[PDB]
Amino acid sequence: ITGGSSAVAGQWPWQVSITYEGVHVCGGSLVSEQWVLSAAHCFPSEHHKEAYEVKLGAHQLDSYSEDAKVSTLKDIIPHPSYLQEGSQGDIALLQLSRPITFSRYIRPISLPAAQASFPNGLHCTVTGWGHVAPSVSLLTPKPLQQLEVPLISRETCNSLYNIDAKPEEPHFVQEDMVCAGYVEGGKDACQGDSGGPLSCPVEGLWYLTGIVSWGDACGARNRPGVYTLASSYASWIQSKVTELQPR
């Protein structure tokens, strides 16, 4: 996250860190005792399931904490429509190997209904342990970063991405995506934030409005972060989790 600030421990208790072969690669959001949502692009087919871990209840990634829990994954389920980089369906359900117990530092985030609308300009927050500037790593001990970002409609976002765009390097914000951030840049998610939550405030609660999908903008002007809408997948998430692990 570039241009944000350090969250405090317990502030975003649904934020998780996903590691591959011990290295943080993406964020994710806890959505129940045994399920996390992240981005499909974080789980390439070539990777081995057994090499992933999810760290929950973490504030500083490099710090030991008695509140944190680390888990392996029993199942990784990218949405079937995710075909390639930039694609729609950039979302994945991950089932932890074992259920965790909720605590002051580990709590799920409520998912929006299929038709929940989060209005243009709503101030949401994106969190993550990704780079704090282009090709600049968050410095140890790596306190979770947070950034308040207004929602930007996919239509506006597509117009921005068109500005000084590389003809070959397209950036189409799909119908299942929304953007958030600032036209003037300096403040966005960076490499390592993708898969993580865009948490929006509604009615005194927080909802997972989005999952960081293109999380490499890293403060470029005219390049707000692009998020997969959780609402677009409410039905699918509910169907997969109910079938696979009913309550």
Residue spans of the domains in the chain: they are 1-12+109-231, 13-108+232-247
Task: Quote the tokens at residue 20.
Answer: 């591959």
> Which residue among the candidates 17, 38, 71, 194 is catalytic per the annotation?
194
- Catalytic residue (choose from 41, 59, 79, 131): 41
Q: Is 164 a catalytic residue?
A: no
Tell me whether residue 205 is exposed, middle or buried, using C-beta atoms within 10 angstroms of its C-beta: 0 to 12, 13 to 18, 19 or more.
Answer: exposed
Tokens of 232: 């677009």
> Residue 237: enclosing H or E segment and its boundaries?
helix 234-244
In CATH, the number for domain 1-12+109-231 is: 2.40.10.10
Q: Residue 25 is encoded by which pair of tokens? A: 């690669």
Q: Which of 189, 191, 224, 231 is nearest to 210 (CA)?
A: 231
User: Is 194 a known active-site residue?
Assistant: yes
Beta strands in 43-133 (DSSP E): 52-56, 69-71, 73-78, 92-96, 123-128
The technique is X-ray
Q: What is the structure's resolution, reported in angstroms to one decimal?
A: 1.7
Instruction: Write down the CATH number for the domain with range 13-108+232-247.
Output: 2.40.10.10
Q: CA–CA distance from 164 to each of 156, 179, 180 (Å)?
A: 15, 18, 19
Q: What are the C-alpha distances in Å from 206 to residues 49, 144, 197?
A: 30, 18, 11
Residue 243 to residue 229: CA distance in whole angstroms: 22
Q: Do domains 1-12+109-231 and 13-108+232-247 have the same CATH topology?
A: yes
Catalytic residue among 79, 90, 193, 216: 90
Question: What is the Cα–Cα distance from 89 to 80, expressed in whole angstroms?
Answer: 7
